[PDB]
Design a protein around this motif. Structure first.
Motif, PDB file in Angstrom:
ATOM      1  N   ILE A 299      37.105 -13.842  29.457  1.00  0.00           N
ATOM      2  CA  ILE A 299      38.043 -14.066  28.367  1.00  0.00           C
ATOM      3  C   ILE A 299      39.471 -13.798  28.825  1.00  0.00           C
ATOM      4  O   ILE A 299      40.409 -14.463  28.375  1.00  0.00           O
ATOM      5  CB  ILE A 299      37.652 -13.211  27.152  1.00  0.00           C
ATOM      6  N   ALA A 300      39.667 -12.828  29.724  1.00  0.00           N
ATOM      7  CA  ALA A 300      41.016 -12.540  30.200  1.00  0.00           C
ATOM      8  C   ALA A 300      41.599 -13.725  30.958  1.00  0.00           C
ATOM      9  O   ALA A 300      42.770 -14.068  30.784  1.00  0.00           O
ATOM     10  CB  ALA A 300      41.021 -11.286  31.075  1.00  0.00           C
ATOM     11  N   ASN A 302      40.503 -16.884  30.599  1.00  0.00           N
ATOM     12  CA  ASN A 302      40.700 -17.919  29.591  1.00  0.00           C
ATOM     13  C   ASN A 302      42.052 -17.750  28.919  1.00  0.00           C
ATOM     14  O   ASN A 302      42.804 -18.716  28.757  1.00  0.00           O
ATOM     15  CB  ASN A 302      39.584 -17.872  28.552  1.00  0.00           C
ATOM     16  N   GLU A 303      42.372 -16.517  28.536  1.00  0.00           N
ATOM     17  CA  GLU A 303      43.699 -16.168  28.052  1.00  0.00           C
ATOM     18  C   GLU A 303      44.783 -16.551  29.046  1.00  0.00           C
ATOM     19  O   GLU A 303      45.793 -17.149  28.669  1.00  0.00           O
ATOM     20  CB  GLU A 303      43.743 -14.668  27.773  1.00  0.00           C
ATOM     21  N   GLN A 362      47.119  -9.544  35.677  1.00  0.00           N
ATOM     22  CA  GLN A 362      45.722  -9.674  35.293  1.00  0.00           C
ATOM     23  C   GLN A 362      44.854 -10.061  36.480  1.00  0.00           C
ATOM     24  O   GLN A 362      43.737  -9.552  36.634  1.00  0.00           O
ATOM     25  CB  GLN A 362      45.603 -10.720  34.197  1.00  0.00           C
ATOM     26  N   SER A 385      40.890  -6.242  26.607  1.00  0.00           N
ATOM     27  CA  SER A 385      41.105  -7.638  26.939  1.00  0.00           C
ATOM     28  C   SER A 385      41.196  -8.486  25.689  1.00  0.00           C
ATOM     29  O   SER A 385      42.064  -9.346  25.592  1.00  0.00           O
ATOM     30  CB  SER A 385      39.978  -8.134  27.837  1.00  0.00           C
ATOM     31  N   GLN A 386      40.315  -8.257  24.717  1.00  0.00           N
ATOM     32  CA  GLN A 386      40.361  -9.061  23.503  1.00  0.00           C
ATOM     33  C   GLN A 386      41.632  -8.804  22.713  1.00  0.00           C
ATOM     34  O   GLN A 386      42.209  -9.743  22.157  1.00  0.00           O
ATOM     35  CB  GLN A 386      39.130  -8.801  22.639  1.00  0.00           C
ATOM     36  N   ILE A 389      44.279 -10.626  24.510  1.00  0.00           N
ATOM     37  CA  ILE A 389      44.130 -12.058  24.293  1.00  0.00           C
ATOM     38  C   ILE A 389      44.672 -12.442  22.932  1.00  0.00           C
ATOM     39  O   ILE A 389      45.346 -13.459  22.782  1.00  0.00           O
ATOM     40  CB  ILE A 389      42.658 -12.466  24.437  1.00  0.00           C
ATOM     41  N   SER A 390      44.343 -11.658  21.910  1.00  0.00           N
ATOM     42  CA  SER A 390      44.972 -11.860  20.614  1.00  0.00           C
ATOM     43  C   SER A 390      46.479 -11.801  20.761  1.00  0.00           C
ATOM     44  O   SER A 390      47.204 -12.635  20.215  1.00  0.00           O
ATOM     45  CB  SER A 390      44.489 -10.801  19.628  1.00  0.00           C
ATOM     46  N   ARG A 393      47.608 -15.047  22.482  1.00  0.00           N
ATOM     47  CA  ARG A 393      47.525 -16.175  21.568  1.00  0.00           C
ATOM     48  C   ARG A 393      48.643 -16.107  20.541  1.00  0.00           C
ATOM     49  O   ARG A 393      49.253 -17.125  20.211  1.00  0.00           O
ATOM     50  CB  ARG A 393      46.156 -16.210  20.883  1.00  0.00           C
TER      51      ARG A 393
END
Length: 474
Positions: A299-300, A302-303, A362, A385-386, A389-390, A393
């Motif tokens: 996810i990191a 993807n971010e 990162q 990480s989430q 990512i928020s 975004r």
């Protein structure tokens, strides 16, 4: 600290402002009487007072410099509490209005005015501490303890807060508090003023979020109210023990004798057991099992990829905007929109540099495998990480919102409220994304170095947009 500036100017400036605040509240006291005009006059006067207050305190913190972040942080929290209590008085007046002193509401209003007087005294002491490196410790500790005392005071008020916090974030707060008081006892051993103030700031952030989040989470409706009764109970005692540890911190710094030291240690572990009581209540109240959706790494990146693409696209779709001389769309033909547009394009470039530097940091982090083979690191870096990512975004959202701010400025906006709101939230969004980056970051790593370089770039973008907007419409 930049340039040949010095703090003493700011010292005296906030001295004057604190005075002005004193008479502002004094006059608004009686401004409770009369018609709306007098009361509003003094209200706006106080508004201007606190405004120039904020400005001069900002520049004073700048004067302090990166060397001692703790002083800036503590004073800014002080002025923060000052402003919020100002708003508390303002709201109460707005309620406790048109009623002579006999009203219980205006009675509370007078009490709150006196409370703000005390807050002003506190801020005076904060300035005092700002002056001397000699004894910042005990005064930061005081500010700390009366601070948490008044959050206690808020807590004794049965009120509906905004939301009811998630038990999982709340329990993360719990464990953070346990490690926090670990550091607190550590500093008590240290007997170091700078460590004292750093730990103080650590508290005023961590324990504050702790106790508040305790409040919201307990206040969740569907859960059994006995559960929240127990939660609030236990949180009361944890606040009590927090205070008691604080008090013994004060004594120990005054009294380096080991008796008080070991007392503080044992009291801290009593409080830790109490924190475990909160932990057990929290796990009791949460009615759900799975939390972490995806591994922090994948996810990191993807971010990383999405944010990089988003900000390069933002820069490009801002470049396709041009400074044009049409008054039909751009309702104001003043070249200030030209200046703002150029600044905004520079801001897009700075944000692109920022996402690139964050991408590099990162990449370095995942290269070390910092996500950790231990599952504890898996989960904690997953939530890190989430959140980041928020953050990314929403900074992509902020950059886009900047894009529509520019496109509408081309289309003409003429009421710069939305534009400046967008710019300021871009600044804050960037701030929080950098924060999420800086989580558990080895300070002297080059990743952090270029990341902070890009962050400074975006901070200069923020300064430029701020100065343009205040310049805009004079």
């Amino acid at each position: 600290r930049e340039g040949a500036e010095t703090f003493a100017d700011h010292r005296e400036g906030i001295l004057k402002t604190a005075k002005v605040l004193v008479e502002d509240t004094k006059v608004l006291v009686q401004n409770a009487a009369g018609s709306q005009e007098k009361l509003a006059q003094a209200a706006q006067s106080s508004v201007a007072t606190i405004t120039r207050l904020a400005d001069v305190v900002k520049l004073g913190a700048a004067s302090l410099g990166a060397e001692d972040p703790e002083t800036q942080v503590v004073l800014i929290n002080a002025v923060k509490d000052v402003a919020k209590a100002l708003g508390d008085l303002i709201s109460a007046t707005k309620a406790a209005a048109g009623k002579v002193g006999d009203d219980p509401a205006v009675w509370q209003l007078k009490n709150s005015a006196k409370v703000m007087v005390t807050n002003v005294t506190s801020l005076l002491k904060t300035v005092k501490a700002v002056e001397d490196e000699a004894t910042k410790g005990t005064r930061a500790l005081e500010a700390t303890t009366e601070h948490i005392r008044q959050e206690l005071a808020v807590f004794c008020s049965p009120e509906p807060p905004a939301k009811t916090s998630t038990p999982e974030d709340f329990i993360r707060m719990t464990k953070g508090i346990t490690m926090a008081t670990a550091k607190a006892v550590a500093a008590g051993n240290s007997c170091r003023q700078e460590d004292v103030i750093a730990t103080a700031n650590l508290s005023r952030r961590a324990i504050a979020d702790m106790l508040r989040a305790c409040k919201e989470a307990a206040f969740h409706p569907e859960v059994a109210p006995d559960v929240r009764l127990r939660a609030l109970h236990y949180g009361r005692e944890c606040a009590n023990g927090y205070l008691e540890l604080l008090d013994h911190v004060l004594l120990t710094l005054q009294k380096p004798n080991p008796d008080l030291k070991q007392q503080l240690t044992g009291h801290s572990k009593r409080v830790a057991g109490s924190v475990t009581e909160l932990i057990q209540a929290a796990e009791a109240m949460k009615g759900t099992e799975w939390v972490d959706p995806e591994d922090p790494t994948v996810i990191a990146e993807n971010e990383l990829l999405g944010a990089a693409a988003a900000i390069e696209a933002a820069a490009k779709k801002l470049e396709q905007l041009k400074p044009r001389a049409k008054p039909k769309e751009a309702d104001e033909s003043l070249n200030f929109e030209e200046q703002i547009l150029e600044a905004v394009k520079s801001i897009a470039a700075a944000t692109s540099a920022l996402v690139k530097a964050a991408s590099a940091a990162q990449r370095e982090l995942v290269a070390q495998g910092k996500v950790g083979a231990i599952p504890a690191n898996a989960l904690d870096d997953g939530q890190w990480s989430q959140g980041l990512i928020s953050a990314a975004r929403m900074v992509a959202a902020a950059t886009n919102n900047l894009c529509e701010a520019a496109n509408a400025a081309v289309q003409g906006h003429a009421s710069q409220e939305k534009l400046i709101s967008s710019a300021k939230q871009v600044a804050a969004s960037t701030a929080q994304l950098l924060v999420a980056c800086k989580v558990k970051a080895d300070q002297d790593s080059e990743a952090m170095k270029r990341l902070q370089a890009a962050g400074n770039a975006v901070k200069r973008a923020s300064d430029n947009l701020v100065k343009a907007a205040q310049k805009a419409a004079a």
